[PDB]
Amino acid sequence: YPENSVAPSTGELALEDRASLRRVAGLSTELADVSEVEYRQLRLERVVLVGVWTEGSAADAEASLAELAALAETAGSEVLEGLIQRRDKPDPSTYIGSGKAAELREVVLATGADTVICDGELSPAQLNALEKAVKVKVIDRTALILDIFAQHATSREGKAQVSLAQMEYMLPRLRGWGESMSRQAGGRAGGAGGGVGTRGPGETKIETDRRRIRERMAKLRREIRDMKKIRDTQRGSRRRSEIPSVAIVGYTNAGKSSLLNALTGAGVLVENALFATLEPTTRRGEFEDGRPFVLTDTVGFVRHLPTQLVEAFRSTLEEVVDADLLIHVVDGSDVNPLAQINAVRTVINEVVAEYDIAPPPELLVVNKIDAATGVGLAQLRRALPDAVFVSARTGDGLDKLRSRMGELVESTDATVDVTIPYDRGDLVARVHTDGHVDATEHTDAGTRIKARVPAPLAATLREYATFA
Amino acid sequence: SSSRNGRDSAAQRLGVKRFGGQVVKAGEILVRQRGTHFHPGVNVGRGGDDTLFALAPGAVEFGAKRGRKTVNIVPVARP
RNA sequence: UAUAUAGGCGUCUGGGGGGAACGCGGGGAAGUGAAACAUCUCAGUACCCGUAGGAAGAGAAAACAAAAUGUGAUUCCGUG
RNA sequence: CUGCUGUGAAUCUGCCGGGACCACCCGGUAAGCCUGAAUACUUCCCAGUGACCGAUAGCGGAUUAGUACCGUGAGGGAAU
RNA sequence: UCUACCCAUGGCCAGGGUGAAGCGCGGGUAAGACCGCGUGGAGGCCCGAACCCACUUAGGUUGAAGACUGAGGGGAUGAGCUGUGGGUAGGGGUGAAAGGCCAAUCAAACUCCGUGAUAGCUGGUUCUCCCCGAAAUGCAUUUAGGUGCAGCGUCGCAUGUUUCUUGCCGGAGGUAGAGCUACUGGAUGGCCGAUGGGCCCCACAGGGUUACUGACGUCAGCCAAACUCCGAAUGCCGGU
RNA sequence: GAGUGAGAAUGCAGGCAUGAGUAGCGAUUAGGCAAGUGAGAACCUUGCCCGCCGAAAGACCAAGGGUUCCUGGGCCAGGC
RNA sequence: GUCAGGUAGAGAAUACUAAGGCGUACGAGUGAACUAUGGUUAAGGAACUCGGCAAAAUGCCCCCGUAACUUCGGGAGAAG
RNA sequence: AAAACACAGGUCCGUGCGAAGUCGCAAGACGAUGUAUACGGACUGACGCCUGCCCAAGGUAGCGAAAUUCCUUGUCGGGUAAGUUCCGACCUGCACGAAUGGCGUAACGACUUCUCAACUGUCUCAACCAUAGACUCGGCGAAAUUGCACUACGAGUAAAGAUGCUCGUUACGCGCGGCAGGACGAAAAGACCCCGGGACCUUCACUACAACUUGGUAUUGGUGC
RNA sequence: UCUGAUCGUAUUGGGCCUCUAACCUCGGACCGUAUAUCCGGUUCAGGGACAGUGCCUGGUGGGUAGUUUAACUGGGGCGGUUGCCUCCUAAAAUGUAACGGAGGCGCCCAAAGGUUCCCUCAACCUGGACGGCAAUCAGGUGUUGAGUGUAAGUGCACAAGGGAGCUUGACUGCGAGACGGACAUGUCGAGCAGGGACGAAAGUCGGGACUAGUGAUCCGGCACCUCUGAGUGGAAGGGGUGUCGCUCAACGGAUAAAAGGUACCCCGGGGAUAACAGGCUGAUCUUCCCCAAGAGUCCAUAUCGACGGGAUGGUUUGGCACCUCGAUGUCGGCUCGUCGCAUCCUGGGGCUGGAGCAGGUCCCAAGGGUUGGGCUGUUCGCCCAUUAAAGCGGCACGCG
């Protein structure tokens, strides 16, 4: 079974140009604000990242690590360094290239480390192969994605659906690393909490006994069954009223909540994190002339949407498929906003595949104008396709986002001319308050005007609609 | 789920063996102690392990001097 | 085969098997006790083989003893 | 004091024992025999005995008893 | 004498099918191989009674019976079935091998003997009244459901209040409580304040500084089995 | 001087209850009548009729049994 | 182990019968539920059930026609 | 009662012949009245298939395929209303496993698991009929079990599941035929689990012995170096 | 014979080659013998002092036998302990369990021991080249906060802490009287003599400031002794004194010497102890509630409702081990049920983000009803086609 064992001796794994024990390990990551990463005690885990170069190049090569460093920071632990490889072939064992297990163990011992991350879901063995070698707590992209939601959880809906997603992510890897984590347990506090992550509930662990895990997944599934009824009951008035609705669809950190605060005077939370707004929240707004429409946010969508966590985004998906006009917020940080938008848009495709109604009208926007395009200039503003953006990284003025949004929203409101006579002392008040008052060509006595009206007011004034 | 603890030591029966106003023969132990909880006064001697023993027949007495409790053997008068 | 012997022939005298115990000689367990177990004990018992006698076996110092002028085959009892 | 295997002496200034052994003393005189009495036991017989049983007892067997009967056999084995 | 295998000598297998070799004839050919036809009747061949076995199901299950019956089943010229007579005997046999069978039992058969095996285990242990009257603890244990010693019972002997209760007197304690600016810890909000940074002069030296920080310290309120500057009540040890 | 005191040992020997006058009275064929016998008859004897086996449930031989064969007599045990 | 009638049959299967031998040893009633052994079942046809378990169904003789594959023997009584 | 044993076939090892091997303390016996084409042991278990340049010394030399199924990797459909066994094209780079183990295989099987046709009381869903019991009458006549007795129910209490105790309810005495919910029903001093003892088995547990083998010496001698 | 090469002759062992008379041959031929594949005898032919057998001896040896294979343990296993020392638990004398909370030990020192004498640190402040926060030095403040070889505690500034001089008491022969104590062990000891050390003397010295640093008996080793000495003198051996050898650590130590399987099992017992069942608890679970931040278009309460808090039921996973092991037979299905309501349908209401059609949630309501199939052992669940619905639960997870 053991053949010539000279592979890292003379042979090269995937060294087309740069691979096979190269471990570029560039881009040392890390970032410092005022120093005092912790200020009293171990508030940083001194984590390290990993990346596997695949289809693509510098356009995306470092993009994975760029996203992961920010995400781990959001979790609240200093990222020491990142490490990738060209990796022509993803080895199912550890898909890391030449199995440089000793090399990575040594380069993580040279650093404080004591925590490692990965990119993509890892099979139980696909991660044990590195757990053994590294001898340190290892938690991959989906584990951290779930831990972020757990930490940020606020309401029963979240504390149940994130819990279910975590249990079901454990399901395929209940053997091995889960027992490895429980062995020493959290030890006061671990690097991965439970249902609420940020202390509080979920302090004990995620998976401890297969029986209890299955029991709790059952109970949680019933709970989401209950919550679906509750949610559809709550979402009655809008569907019963046929009131146009719009949705803020942004990848993450694209200032969706901040934009909502703007344009509606809303006071929703706007925190620095890739997953800040927990549940889709909405508010009534007014178009240019009226139309007391509805505007809702969306929850963060990150590249390679972890399918292990869909119960959380199910509510968001419903709220986007039950809408008319979609406005696509982007974040002006990365270098490939085109990739950001295409990636986030890859999800609406399956959204419509499942709940096919229609392709809703689409509009584009990108926040962070003040800090973005520092070397981009107005190329993305003139040459690039449909897009409007004035929000700043803190807030700005809105000029035509509220005009084109109305011109692109459903125009179901009939605009056929109607004749309103004097009749009662203020009979025209009904039309003035309902159907807007656009073009109030007030004349005299039995004032003659031209304004739009909805289906019931149109049918009520039909007989009185005498041509001009 | 073993326990690291579980060990202990035997019963070193320390403590005062003759209390105030007790008639003693020469050589008897008065307190078995560890260290110098008590000191010797008159007719009281210290042994190897900080034991206190009588040096004359008499009656035990506990007093203080210079800030340290001391044990003494007051000589009983023959009636 | 030569002496000769094996062998053959005849004739005379004996053995053969049984018996309850006891005798002498020879093989000889294990259960058990040891709070387990192997030395050890059980025990030279059980059992077996040989072999008799009215009884057998041992018996006439190449002995004990200790300076006593000692006792004087063997056997079996009682002490030691 | 003895059984097997090797080796292997002197005839009285000889040889053995006297609790390793050595000297002096002391006791015997190996490698040849036979020998009663005191002593162990009751298959059997005769005459008695019992602070022994008295028919579920006393022998398994007071009556067909090693019978009937059970087992291929060794063997077990009643009741009156 | 059952059963496993083996040996000697006998016996049994209704009926009906297919048709291998061998042999003869004819084609194919140098040539046989090969191809049709005939006799022939091989086969651990086929179907199926006797016979042998035991796959399914029902019945029985204090049965008709300590392994059977009914109805279907498998083999049925063969490694076949069976009669009579023999051989292999227990740590041994025999085994197309199941720890199967060896006389209704087999991970070592039966009977008698050693033998009244041993069992820290379970059961049993037979008439009466009077007096006294427990323990379920400590230590040790190839020990924990046993046992030895001590403790606690009873009886005899010796002394006699030494026993015990109450008062008073003489003692050591660090528990309850309480206290922390008295020790070791954590911690609550203020006050001043080095580090300072950043700012105004501008040096960098030298002056103010500065939503702020807490070095030390200060004020008010805290708490602790393994904290104690203190510290009871009971208990205990003597005397009277 | 004791084989001296039983209510228990799923104790042992004998006798007798409860279940209970209860289950069962043993194959898959089947008996009926007339007459007799006799105290007594479904079961015995005779005559008829009906039914069953008929590669036996008929007739022999061997092993095994040991008198069970036949005649006369008898009917308290046995014959479910 | 030996004998092996007649008819239908290939048959020593099966059915009924000859010779021969039996009716073999508790009966008489009674349309109870229920159990066992047989019989039949409308219409559907495995829905039963762990599973077509059991039961049903085909079944004989003579003529036609017989597949995939094959160790060239078969398959094969193919099946129809 | 089978997939297990056997089997014809194959491959190793021992045996040169009162062999090897086995029974026996030995003699002796079988093997064998046989002789390496034979005998004994050991695995496997008809039959077919399994792959090249280096490979008085050429060099990494392991093929680097296959008829490969752990291969629920949805990796799709056929199987039907919904279909398990399966059937076929994909992900199936050390995957795997096989130089002596794997693939195929006609025929066969009271083997295991499925689909179709026919057939049906298996079922929807049961009804009826006959016989043998049951039942009644006559005769004979047991058995296991058994501390007792003119042996209710509810809620409680109790060694924690009450015929037997407490408080209430209900019930005329005695039988017959049936059902099977209790009497922790009968049966067997629980086979499970633990403790103690035992037995048999395994082994590089301990200690012995059989047997084998190594040397000294007796049998055991002479002459030459 | 003392200091001593080689000698002449006679006594011998081994290695090697042979021979024949020991011995061997199931190689032949004859005789007992009429039959004899037995056996013995004669002789021939081959081996041959080998082989085989006796006594002795070293290896291999489950081929066979006798046995061992600990205990605690919130059942057993697995894991972890097993002796000694210190603290808390430990309830102010001593003592006191738990698989309770923390740790150390299996030594070290010839000076870190004895004695005589002298000194006082840590920390802080002020000043000084390297030299700094911290080295050495100066002054001051500094009563214990440094240190005390080693764990923790009790004590130590009177110093037991820090230096120095000299010394070996890290003695021999004892020991009144006590502590602790099941016993065996274990600790203290004033003082007497001999000979020493230190000190002017008085005085202290029988190891370390104290408490751990260890192992019974048996058996045997090594030095000395006025012991004993198997007739006697000796010697052998024994005896006394002093000491030596055990991770006998399972540390009161069965043997000098020892692991496992059993579903092929068996016997004696146990509800002292488990699996099912009941019983208590309710951690877990289910049913809800309290408060309301927030969501819900505005709007806490139509519908939800976080962070927190309180309970009900005894169905889940568990805890305990109270009855039952001289027997309480396990799951799913079938037949037959009966009950609770926490209501799936049918029935009556409130509110509604109730236009109507319908929906949501809550209240009252248990009369009756609540399908057939394919897969799924499946605990269970997925699918198919219907219905008004295909309810949830208890009854030994009802009923063998």
Ligand SMILES: Nc1nc2c(ncn2[C@@H]2O[C@H](COP(=O)(O)OP(=O)(O)CP(=O)(O)O)[C@@H](O)[C@H]2O)c(=O)[nH]1
């Ligand atoms: N680009 C942008 N960023 C803003 C704006 N206002 C605030 N931010 C910053 O962006 C940070 C992230 O908030 P925001 O991007 O609104 O979160 P989100 O993208 O709406 C929702 P999620 O974070 O889950 O993806 C905040 O810390 C805030 O300081 C804005 O108008 N535009």
